[PDB]
Amino acid sequence: KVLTLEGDLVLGGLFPVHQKPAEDCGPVNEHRGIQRLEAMLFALDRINRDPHLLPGVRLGAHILDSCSKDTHALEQALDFVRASLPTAITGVIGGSYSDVSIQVANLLRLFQIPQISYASTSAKLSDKSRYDYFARTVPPDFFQAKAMAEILRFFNWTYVSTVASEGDYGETGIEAFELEARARNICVATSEKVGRAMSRAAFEGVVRALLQKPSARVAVLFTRSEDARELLAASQRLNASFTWVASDGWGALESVVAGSEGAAEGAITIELASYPISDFASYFQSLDPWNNSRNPWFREFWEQRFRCSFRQRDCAAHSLRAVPFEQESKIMFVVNAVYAMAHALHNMHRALCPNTTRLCDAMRPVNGRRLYKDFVLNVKFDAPFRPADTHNEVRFDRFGDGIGRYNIFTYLRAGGRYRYQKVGYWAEGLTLDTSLIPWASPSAGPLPASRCSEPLQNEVKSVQPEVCCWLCIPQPYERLDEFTCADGLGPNASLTGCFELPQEYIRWGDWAVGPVTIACLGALATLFVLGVFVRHNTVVKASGRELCYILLGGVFLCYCMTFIFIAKPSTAVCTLRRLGLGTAFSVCYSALLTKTNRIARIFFISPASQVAICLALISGQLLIVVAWLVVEAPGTTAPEVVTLRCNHRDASMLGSLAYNVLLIALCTLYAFKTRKCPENFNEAKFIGFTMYTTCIIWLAFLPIFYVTSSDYRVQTTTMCVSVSLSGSVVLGCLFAPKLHIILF
Amino acid sequence: KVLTLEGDLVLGGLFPVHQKPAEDCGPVNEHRGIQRLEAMLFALDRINRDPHLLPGVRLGAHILDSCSKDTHALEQALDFVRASLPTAITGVIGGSYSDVSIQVANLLRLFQIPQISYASTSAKLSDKSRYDYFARTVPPDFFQAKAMAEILRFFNWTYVSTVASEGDYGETGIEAFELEARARNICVATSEKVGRAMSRAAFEGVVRALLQKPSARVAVLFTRSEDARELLAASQRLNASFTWVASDGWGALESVVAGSEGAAEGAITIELASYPISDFASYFQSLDPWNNSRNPWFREFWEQRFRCSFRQRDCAAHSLRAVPFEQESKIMFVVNAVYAMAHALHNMHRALCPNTTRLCDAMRPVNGRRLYKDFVLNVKFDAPFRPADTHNEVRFDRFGDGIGRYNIFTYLRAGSGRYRYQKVGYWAEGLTLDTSLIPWASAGPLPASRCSEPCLQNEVKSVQEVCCWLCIPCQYELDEFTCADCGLGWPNLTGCFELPQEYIRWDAWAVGPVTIACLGALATLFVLGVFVRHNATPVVKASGRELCYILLGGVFLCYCMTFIFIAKPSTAVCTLRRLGLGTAFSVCYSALLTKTNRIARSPASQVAICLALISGQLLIVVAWLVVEAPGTETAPERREVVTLRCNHRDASMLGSLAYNVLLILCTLYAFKTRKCPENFNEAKFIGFTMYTTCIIWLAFLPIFYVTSSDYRVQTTTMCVSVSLSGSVVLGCLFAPKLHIIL
């Protein structure tokens, strides 16, 4: 059957009056069908009574039934399309389920008929390429993903788990939430799926999968009513508690929390926002079958509601005023849709018809394209029958979807008698009032946290073996990158680079003061001795007289080594020191060897031969020294400062000292031959004393050298003062008696 | 009006009988509507009389008129859907224009009715989400773009320009062609578009814009016939020459080319392939209005065709057999579509109801989904009424688009007054043609349009369109963009080459310095010997000649610098060269200075005074040496870089030699004593020697500045000056002794 009301313009409608075997239509749906249909009739009466909207033209209706099946609705829409070619349908206000809306839109876009849908929220319907002529007064479903992502973010939760149901509702929402969470820098731990028919142990499987990765105590649900009920029951069985964030499927229903109330504490849920229409209740309460003849489906609804038959005349007793009335959620959207179409036609009248209250001949056919593209999509008005305080308004976004307002709820521990409570809303951004949720005002510890890793540069932010998680791992000694550590001989404050440590060295400003002073004193004394020696080259000529000058020269050479020693270490400096000690020591002892050899030589011997022998020994020691260092080419860090040192070892220096010791031993034996032989003021005793003194000095120095080689700050000083003391000892033991005798 | 034929199963059809104001559709379209309608009726009769194809089920028809409008098409197509929800239409074969097919497909997908189209070629219909119940026996258009890309790739033409036309055909084809060309590394030169209602001036402007860049001489057209005629013929009004590649818009039509045969010579065009059906000729010519009473629209067609009327009763005179007959191109596709539908239903009957030849109960509501999903798309058979030699087949791919076979044509004028079309190949799945017949493939080179020639390997392929870049090569500096300097110092471009260092030969120019050095050494030895022999004589024994021995040694050393300087560079060599340089002058100057000073006032103490100065010189040189590692030169022309020098700074050498310059003191100490009348005028000799040394030193100065660039000249001048000073000083000092002795 059809419902018809004559008028100048007729608005079609499509409602799910009967539910879904051989038959195509079953029992009557009370809440969704009859209440919404009567709401549409209420709106049409109120608009025709209003003297500002459509003063002249009267609106009619042509309402059909959908029977909750796409095939039946598509079959019935042929009536509208055929009438488009007795009464011409201006528009269609219908579509309760997503699929019926899809089919009717695909059929009607060809013949250019507008459509406004009051309760279709599928996300596939915003693609205006396929559905050119669609409008709706309810927001699309994917806004809930944005709202839930914002709610999660504002509480600082990063590690989350998601559960979705099979079908379009759970799926499309789940990819929407994933896309938004990726943008908001939120990482999803695991993603599950719940089927239509699933056993209790199979639900234990899902909750066990959720418990597989602990430390995630926030579970996002995008589920229908029955699936959520089973999931909460399964959570009750296994004594597992989380903090749940849900879509409008959970909503504020009481059935989903029934017999498993213990787990449902602290859930945050989102629901569509609505207010009661005061006059609709009064209008609906007074319906009776005898007075209401417009509605063809009122008799069957009354028979089903009051379980009575009309043939026996036993139905007159019952009345709707006795039973309680709970107004359905989406009546507001039906009234808003009808009013929006009315306002669009009113603007079209004010524009096209210049000065006639009645229907002008310019609109006898009505152009769908211009109406939809210009006037329908540009409607702004205060919502009819709005609450007195509120300021709700109706407006369509460019894509055709309506504006969105949501309510946010939590589950409250009232005394006991637990109940839902309101905590905020979502118009354009989250506007939570935190004082009214029992888990945040008392501040009992930190807010229930779902995060994997906490965020300085001191410890490297190593890549965790989950990609989202970043484990913090501290080189103390040696990092080029944030997660990588770099390395060398000789770390910066910024800790991303390296700063070169100073290269330690013995400086002249330091320990070195005394050696320098004694070196200058000895050098000056040696110069004066050389001068007084050359001055009277006379008592001088008796004892060789040439060994004396080289005797002074060796002492002078020794002094040169003292400055050589304490200097900046380089390859040149290392070569110079590795050579000079051998030359100095060798010459100094060689002179004495030759002198002692000549003493008592008769009991060959000539001025020319002695210098040849001395030069031969000096050259032998020098050649040994050259090979060592020539083999040991020179070059200048600890596992615990960047000291500079020559890599060459000291064993060769020990060998040079050993050759020197052999020389001194030969001197000792020769002086033992003739301890004090008087030839020229009896020098031989002085020679012997010098030999003993050199023996003692070397015996003190070389073992001390080996002992103190460990520490650098002492070793070089000990070496230099030791050698200088040896040289001054040689001077005092050899020259000094001759100095006193010839001086006076 | 509607044509209906009674039968067990009924097939619907759409045909544009009338063309496209108050009136809905006007004059009757003969070639496009009537011929194809008679084709469908012919196929249905033939199939109904066939022995082994649907033997017991008789097919019927329900044909409608589209009037070439989408809205009218939808209004008439409502009948098919209202039948199901009353002859129970099974499938619809129709849709000539693209828009009608799109609209009817959108309407019919809802109620699940299959559709086969004979002449809809738009690329939008390949999408399966929007239209999932569409199959066509004619290939889509972008196959033409693929074929064009292949044709251009075969002849190696890489710089081409594209001209398109407004309307889905043009932009869709051009987009497909650019995609396929970029797939095959073909770069576009210029793009242009032709409007709906441009004038002759605009066409001339388009031709001028095409001629703006002459690097391309091959033009790709995706245009309709009217635009093609105006563009081509307007290539004589302004003289121009190009090679044309065109879509089916040009084809083999004789109307598009008229009076502009010059500009159109050498063209290449692509056209769909079809073959005549001989039986249709007899069937169509045999038709008469009284005999063929079932067709509703034949009377109007005769009235329009022969210009007669029923009221005057003059129409009986005319007959169809008199006038010549020409076949429409897509009649093959019409018959193929009907036969494909029949074969699909036959497979349904064979598989689903294998027990009875007649119609079965299970089939009475025919399920569209099963038909389309399983039996329509997998049908393959021999084409009906095919030519005897050829082997064609009817099949559909996954998307419902049919196979594609094209023909390739080229213009040709041979005997005088014989301009005409000829075939040069085909395109079934890969391009195939022979150049044997083509006129221009060895009367000159192959006509080419390539922006740049291939770049040389050795020459640098400068990276400046993709093919636009020309070749720019370069000096001393492997790949296209890898131009790198071969280090400090020689390409092969295998790698950098390091030439051996320039070492002066141990050399003809160097011979002379050795000769003068040997002369100096021999003379100094002779002087030393004649001094040794003459020791007893008073002339030499008066001073004692101790300074004479050291002067001879200094002379020997300064001669020895001649050999020392000319040697292969080495760290030790450079160090010794630096060291001895000051040493020679210091020894000589100290010797002369001591010879003056000892009598300017212990003879052996004079040796000590000499020793102090020489030791100081030694100390300063060794300190300046040791300080900087002495060690062992980049230059242009890639031939002077072989030269190398010791790393020690040459200026530091001058700073060191400043001490010896201070010594060059000797003249100061000589000047005051010049008044004293020394025996044999020794002081005068010393002063003359100091002046001579100063003169030689002054002459030394310009040479260094002049030829610091050339190592050879500087070295030769330096050694020459040193030896000259040494020889002059020795001669001056020992002239009295030599004169007295010999």
Ligand SMILES: N[C@](CC1c2ccccc2Oc2ccccc21)(C(=O)O)[C@H]1C[C@@H]1C(=O)O
């Ligand atoms: N608008 C709804 C939304 C619907 C839905 C609603 C709640 C839970 C699950 C669920 O599943 C899907 C899946 C895809 C698209 C839409 C939905 C419709 O049926 O289209 C429905 C509120 C309307 C009404 O019941 O009156």
Ligand SMILES: N[C@](CC1c2ccccc2Oc2ccccc21)(C(=O)O)[C@H]1C[C@@H]1C(=O)O
């Ligand atoms: N198959 C065509 C292709 C058609 C077309 C054909 C040739 C030149 C231009 C041209 O313009 C467009 C533009 C967009 C889509 C289709 C076309 C159709 O109308 O769909 C047409 C051959 C069919 C017939 O006219 O019988």
Ligand SMILES: *[C@@H]1O[C@H](CO)[C@@H](O)[C@H](O)[C@H]1NC(C)=O
């Ligand atoms: C969330 O973290 C931000 C960043 O430190 C902080 O400013 C804010 O106070 C935190 N809010 C809550 C509720 O923890």
Ligand SMILES: *[C@@H]1O[C@H](CO)[C@@H](O)[C@H](O)[C@H]1NC(C)=O
């Ligand atoms: C086309 O180019 C290829 C690649 O160099 C070459 O092998 C072929 O011979 C060319 N053909 C013609 C006709 O130029």
